[PDB]
Amino acid sequence: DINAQILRHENSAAGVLSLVETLLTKGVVGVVAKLGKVNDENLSQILSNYLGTRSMLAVVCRNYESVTALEAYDNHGNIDINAGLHCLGSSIGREIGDSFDAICLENLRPYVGQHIADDLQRRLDLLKPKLPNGECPPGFLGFAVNMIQIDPAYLLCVTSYGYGLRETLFYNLFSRLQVYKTRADMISALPCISDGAVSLDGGIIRKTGIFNLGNRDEVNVRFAKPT
Template sequence: MDSSSDLQAHMIPATPHLSAQTNAILVDDSSASMQVDQTENSVVARDGMQNGGTELVIYNSKRLQDDLQMIGLKIKQHEDHIKLLKSQSLKLGDSILDLQVNLGKYHSAKVDNEDHSNHQNEEETTGQILQHEKSAAGVLCQLKTRHCTQASHLTFTKDVLGIVASLGQLEDENLSSLLSEYLGVDTMLAIVCKTFECVKALETYDKEGHIIKSSGLHGLGASIGRAIDGRFLVICLENLRPFAGEFVVDDPQRRLDLWKPRLPTGECPPGFLGYAVNMINIDSKNLFCATASGHGLRETLFYNLFYRLQVYRTRADMLLALPLISDGAISLDGGIIRSSGVFSLGSR
């Protein structure tokens, strides 16, 4: 018993000691666990904050990109609207120019108050042609006006349309005079034929190449006491290359739809009034079928005579637009540019 009691006595105090160590170990393990948990939570929280911050940056960046894209689309819409308005403005300007041409509003300061009752008419033109008595145009004109019965029996005259000066009229006498000067007397008195057969019939030759004075237009001149003196021009419509573009829409005069000269701003140069070829009034019978192929006088005869001759209000306007002039120009105060680099100076 004693030994057993001693043994128990020795064993009893040892139990609390072991329990304390165990508790200490447990406490230490718990503390370590808490530290590990806190570290893990801290890492998780830090990672969460980093991930959340990155997502926020990405979201804001995408939002800014969307905003920029939307602003870009609005800017493009405004630019498109500006282009559309400019295009409409240019079209309106072109329409105004075309209407001015149609109405004959191309007067200079000197002729604004001119009495239009004195304008050149067909009878006056015929009278002026007849003054050139020994010209081919004078002979032909006299045949048609004073010997119309004789002329009607001449087969080759059926394809003669007339004289250049009589085939078109202008509302403005000043402009008419300027264009006549630009073309020159020989061209103004040129005979216009539909076919080359007609051209050949006007003048014939012997085997040595001399003109047979008793035939053709020379024979007719001799028969009425008006021998033709010197050379004369004949224009054959079927041999001319016609204008290949479009016509002004709904224009009864079938004016040619020509590109207007443009400054870098897109506007027409100041003082530009239009093209000479479109300022001529043509009678209805010659507007459509002057040739067998169905072309009218404007796109054949007058286009080849004037091509893209520009008309300006003043010399100053014309000279300022010089870089835009490639095929000649005239101004209502008497300026003439015959072609690029060729100027007519002096007074008429």
């Protein structure tokens, strides 16, 4: 289950927030590992290895006052118990020993482009690449932002301007990151990429120069599965 994989990271703040959710809380929206649901469990595992466990176990809140409400520093510069999540989680559960990120939706630079018209999941009109002959690259499946299936509450009216969750958060994690089939197909269409690419066989290229190789990573927390 997803929540058991959250509770495996006992030193992380995500299990702390889930334990408070079973029994600060107002500003937060939730963790990224619960918001996104992907049908393709293989592609889910590959994007999970792409993001890294620090970004995907990071909590998202609506405002910046929630960021100032979670952790507060003292006059010396060290983190003590008396901050919000730290005291309210060390009262019952484990402390925060590892780092955790916090992402606030009013400060992100949101997508400002046409959204595919007449669509339910509100996909993004990003430019599909093309080879010199006039055709798409041969193993192109799609941009990785367009795979995540959203809970229909968060599609609109989360931002104070009215933006959704797909065009603020899910753009500013993997912007113009596109999905291929095999790694030789990904190398074959390497000049036509923007920021990175991700192949369904495995193999991760995060920047236009650097690219991972070796084993594929294994992380326990994944995206959830739709029903």
